[PDB]
């Protein structure tokens, strides 16, 4: 359905989160977002694929692979070959 095209993971206060989110909107990239002190489960995923341990943000891709805090560039690469679009 590619609705959940990243899941950001991050905590209200970290440093990165509205830092990546500016990034994210210039860039019109849709995501969905939930934090990470919420849900455990989540917070447990977030933070075996942070940079050792719980700090940066990560998203997690519509293909099911994360990318530890990446840029609005770094993450529309990969995101565009998820979807499609790039083709005839």
């Not at 609705?3 to 993971?9: K, M, V």
């Not at 099911?64 to 995101?79: C, F, I, Q, R, Y």
């Amino acid at each position: 359905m590619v609705t959940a095209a990243l899941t950001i993971y991050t905590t209200s206060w970290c440093g990165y989160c509205l830092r990546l989110k500016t990034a994210l909107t210039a860039n019109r990239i849709a995501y969905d977002e939930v934090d990470i002190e919420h849900n455990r489960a989540a917070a447990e995923f977030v933070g075996s694929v942070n940079g050792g341990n719980r700090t940066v943000p990560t998203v997690k891709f519509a293909d099911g692979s994360t990318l530890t805090n990446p840029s609005a560039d770094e993450v529309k690469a990969k995101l565009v070959k998820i979807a499609g679009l790039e083709h005839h």
